[PDB]
Design a protein around this ligand. Structure first.
Ligand SMILES: NCc1ccc(Cl)cc1
Ligand SMILES: NCc1ccc(Cl)cc1
Ligand code: NA
Lengths: 328, 345, 334
């Protein structure tokens, strides 16, 4: 087991990930990220070649979604079913209608006796953490109000690593440059991915209108993670209020929603980007990326959404398997 | 592989052709495709009635998206997927606006088709099913939309008719099927679709309705065109009646429609439309002995509960056949390949 | 071959009889059927606790119809079907009127039973479950209705009790089980059902409640009838208290219920000091204030193990009804 040049003791890394809950991207260390990226890649090649994907039969999951996040739940359902496991769904409720005046702690204590594991999406931060205390079974956070959404960060990173596999090397001479564009204050997907990218030799352009810029505590985390690996310089983090400057010499453009224009991506705005630049967007989009860009080979936001299948399959496999691993 | 012992079906050849086909409209199904669907449906009927292994399509994952309540049809599709041995993730109890939370139909289907092998889609918007078909990298089966397209209802209607009157398939000038369509023929879109499919064959139509609620001109033109193309059109091909006793005379099939009170000016005008076209053992005495009664269901007042005991009634077998026809269609479309030995027998 | 500590079970014979049986009411389950359910539940308990293969009923497709929210009970049934290796399609987030949309219960179940092997049905209407049973060509398991029939709740309550007090099965005059039912005994239908089942055995009942909320007369009569039939009825068979101190004295089981104000009957470590060493605490759940969170630590509490046993009991019942094996060799046997 290799990613061209890093040997993965997938056995050793699984013994450690077995029955781990994944709430925040900080719950995933370097070795765990390598295992997730290696395994995701195998599910990518197995599904693209129409091979048997059933590496985790015999599990029964509960999926609890206490806000509409139909794309994210469908992605998790598809991953569970494609692995050959089974799922029981709780949807089209909110927190108050589901906890009909019963405690979160009682609910998860009981529900964890029925299933092998739980996919949980709830806009309350409090609730996911109470669920983790009370559950006898691993929980995968599918998203909460504090902007923790680890499978989104993991599929974002997997997507970037497919075009720029040198992000993993921590080589001083091989730096990745990313522009984050739009609502960086409220775009929590940016906060999570920034935290993960700063573990590596990465340089950040935060492109926003003053009012909606990256929060100070996220810039502190980036600075801390860059200093720890001796990749911090005065050039590590730049701030722009316009695309022309922001999109210059960046390998990745990561677009977000801007609710309430200067931050609209078009084929025109993409002319003075590198030949190799790739465009991510966690989706859904509104106006932020013009439909014309879909034809531009730099666009990968739809491949990005697709990779979420492979990354969620990988993570379920590595956590819930009771080991013959996926290969080729 | 034969049907009626007349027509040999190259199920391999026909599968290679149907593989990953979307089915939106009954015109997406040709003669050979219909024969393959009828043959395969029949095998699933005999396999399930004899409690044998039904698992002819195991390794597939479907998404079922129903953006209006159509619980019988959704359950029928779920059951077909699950009985074949495949798996399904469901979207129900949403409408168009709550599901497309201001995201484009194009974007939504582009993403969702990366997660699954196939999509079952029901949406009252016709626009939406067509956009879904353009954007989806995977086959779509229309489970029903606003323009009255509902091809699996047409297919199970036809399968049901062909079980009692297998000569509809022969296109023989001397072996004509006579069907009476009864009730709200303006709004009974199930009639429009089945008419279109029956007119491909040697068939004669009684449209039994009252004034306001007759079969639309565009459907009559389609029937006329399809009958002329197979040299089965005469002055007798299409008759119109405003009452049962004339309408039900010398017809092999009676197809009753839903009559929703929602469709009149008041509850008055609705109750005098029921009564006029309500089916009873009395109204059925001067029908042929071989007459069979279909109804797409639900039945409310259109057919009296006493008729359920009448051996002419098949509307419950009809609903049941939807399982076997949806299993057949999924098998033929979503098998990754076919071998001689792998088809239902 | 199949033994229940010391009772030999002809699981083949009992299955040939239970095959395609509907289970609406706890009285649809006789002595032999209860022994089979307890034996089979126990196997699923040991198989799942040891992460062994649980797939003793693959190849089945169920419909689960829940025409009121009862999310815990629906999840429990879904989990049981999926763990057995079968498949289920769901009808939820509907009520009676939105699902029937003025089509008959009889037509709906006639059609739906052509699609599936079996139906799990929860509906507040009692009329509806009975019409569903007439119309369905396939077995129905009642998951709950308004007349308080909920047989899998009675069965998992009983399974839980039998795990700590296996002598309830012996019908031995010298080995009597004493249970206190606490709270809203008028409206706590789970009490009515369990009482009916426990009274088939050598059992003594403390009904602890106020005045407005006492056990109804007709349930006391059923208990008296079932106790008299097995020569276990005395003037001491049924006692009535309005306070915990007296109610909880010398009882092997405390079964708590919801007391919804539309104070006095709250279980704490203090109220549990004058119970037997061996007493176990059940509660069908959910709880509100009836049991203080401190009691969860008290080894006498088993209400969470109780809810867990619902998985193993619902797996057992689905297996025993819907299995189409022949061989004695194919039954669970840990
Ligand atoms: N209805 C928005 C949407 C898009 C994609 C998916 Cl997978 C699900 C829902
Ligand atoms: N009523 C909230 C709840 C739902 C499911 C389960 Cl299993 C437990 C409690
Ligand atoms: Na499902």
């Amino acid at each position: 087991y290799i990613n061209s040049k890093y040997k993965i003791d997938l056995d050793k890394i699984m013994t450690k990930m077995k029955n781990k809950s994944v709430i925040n991207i900080d719950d995933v260390d370097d070795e765990e990220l390598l295992a997730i990226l290696y395994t995701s890649k195998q599910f990518e090649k197995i599904l693209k070649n129409n091979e048997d994907s059933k590496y985790l039969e015999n599990k029964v999951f509960c999926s609890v979604f206490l806000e509409p996040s139909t794309r994210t739940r469908c992605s998790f359902d598809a991953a569970i079913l494609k692995l050959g496991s089974k799922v029981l769904n709780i949807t089209d409720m909110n927190s108050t209608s589901f906890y009909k005046g019963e405690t979160v702690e009682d609910a998860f204590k009981i529900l964890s006796t029925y299933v092998d594991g739980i996919i949980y999406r709830d806009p309350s931060k409090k609730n996911v953490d109470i669920a983790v205390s009370s559950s006898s079974k691993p929980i995968i956070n599918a998203g909460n109000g504090t902007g923790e959404h680890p499978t989104q960060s993991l599929l974002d990173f997997y997507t970037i690593h497919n075009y720029f596999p040198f992000i993993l090397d921590r080589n001083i001479n091989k730096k990745l440059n990313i522009a984050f564009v739009g609502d960086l204050k409220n775009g929590r997907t940016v906060h999570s991915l920034s935290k993960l990218l700063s573990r590596y030799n990465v340089s950040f352009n935060f492109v926003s209108c003053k009012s909606l810029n990256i929060p100070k505590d996220i810039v502190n985390t980036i600075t801390y993670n860059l200093k720890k690996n001796n990749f911090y310089s005065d050039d590590s983090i730049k701030y722009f209020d316009n695309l022309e400057e922001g999109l210059e010499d960046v390998h990745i453009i990561y677009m977000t929603r801007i609710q309430k224009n200067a931050f609209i991506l078009s084929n025109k705005t993409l002319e003075n980007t590198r030949d190799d630049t790739k465009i991510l967007h966690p989706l859904p989009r509104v106006n932020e990326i013009k439909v014309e860009v879909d034809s531009n080979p730099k666009s990968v936001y739809f491949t990005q959404a697709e990779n979420g299948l492979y990354v969620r399959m990988a993570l379920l496999y590595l956590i819930f398997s009771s080991t013959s691993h996926p290969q080729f």
